[PDB]
Amino acid sequence: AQYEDGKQYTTLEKPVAGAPQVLEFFSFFCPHCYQFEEVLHISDNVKKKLPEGVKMTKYHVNFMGGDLGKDLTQAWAVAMALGVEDKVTVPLFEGVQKTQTIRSASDIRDVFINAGIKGEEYDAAWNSFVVKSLVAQQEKAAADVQLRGVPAMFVNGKYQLNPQGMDTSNMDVFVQQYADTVKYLSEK
Numbered sequence: 001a002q003y004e005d006g007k008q009y010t011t012l013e014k015p016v017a018g019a020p021q022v023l024e025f026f027s028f029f030c031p032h033c034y035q036f037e038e039v040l041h042i043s044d045n046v047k048k049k050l051p052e053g054v055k056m057t058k059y060h061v062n063f064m065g066g067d068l069g070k071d072l073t074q075a076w077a078v079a080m081a082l083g084v085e086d087k088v089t090v091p092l093f094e095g096v097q098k099t100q101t102i103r104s105a106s107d108i109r110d111v112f113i114n115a116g117i118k119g120e121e122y123d124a125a126w127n128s129f130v131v132k133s134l135v136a137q138q139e140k141a142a143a144d145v146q147l148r149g150v151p152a153m154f155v156n157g158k159y160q161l162n163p164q165g166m167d168t169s170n171m172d173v174f175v176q177q178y179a180d181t182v183k184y185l186s187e188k
Contacts (some may be wrong), residue, residue, distance in 0.1 A: 007165045008181045012158050016144045019157025020057040022050065022182065025142060028072050028096045029064040030150045037093055040175050042151075049179045050186060058085075059138040061150055065096075071105045072096075077134035078112070078125040087115040155185040 005011050024043060026033040036042040047056055060076035062069050072092070079085045091111045095102035102108060112122050125131055145154055153161040166177045 003181065003184050007162065008177070009155075009162050009185060010160050012145065012154075012160060014146075016154075016157030019144065019154065020141070021054050021156055021186070022046065022056045023141060023154040023157070024056070024058040025061055025147055025150050025152040025154075026058065027061050027064040027069065027150050028092050028102075029069060031097065033151045034093050034097050036151050037089060040171060042153075042175060042178060045175050046153075046179045046182045049183045051183070054186060057141075059141055061142050061147065062139065063148070064150070068103070068105075068108075071108055073138055074126065074131065074135055075105075075108045075112075077131040077138065078122065080134055081125050081128070081131050082117060082121070084112070084115065084117055087117075088112055091115065153182065155182060155188075159185045159188070161185075 003009070026036070043056065043058060050056070060073040062073050065072065075088075075092070076085075079088050088111055091114070092102070092108070095107065095111055102111070109119075109122060109126075113119060144157070145152075145160070151163075155161075161178065161181060163174075163178060166174055166181075168174050
């Protein structure tokens, strides 16, 4: 076939019922995740090729960056709850990996402030139980699929993208193959 199990994707031995349609995992400490966001714009190009009626989910993970890794998962929960993902994603990535100016929760907080979220609003969110359960959601989803690496994308809780098996000669060609694979898997 043109799309083969173990080639552009793998299949989960243990499928996850009720899972989000398109589910993406990342870490702000994850170097290919930075690329996926800043250079390749994977999430965005997948969305452009997804059928409509399809919802897209992106979660942060704890297993990179120790204590700060967990702070960042809680911050991503804040970002999701306030709907400000598109204004903090870039500065968080650059704060962690480019400038290395993110070293504490207060530094994470600064990124949101500079992006225009009010201190009061940020801290209320940070401490809220809605964010607590949002953090739980992120963890559970990762636990459901035995996740030990990022970036990762799962389709309908039973297929996992396998970017290792796609040409990387051309970044643009890589992205389309990746998105076309999500679409193929989506329709499966």
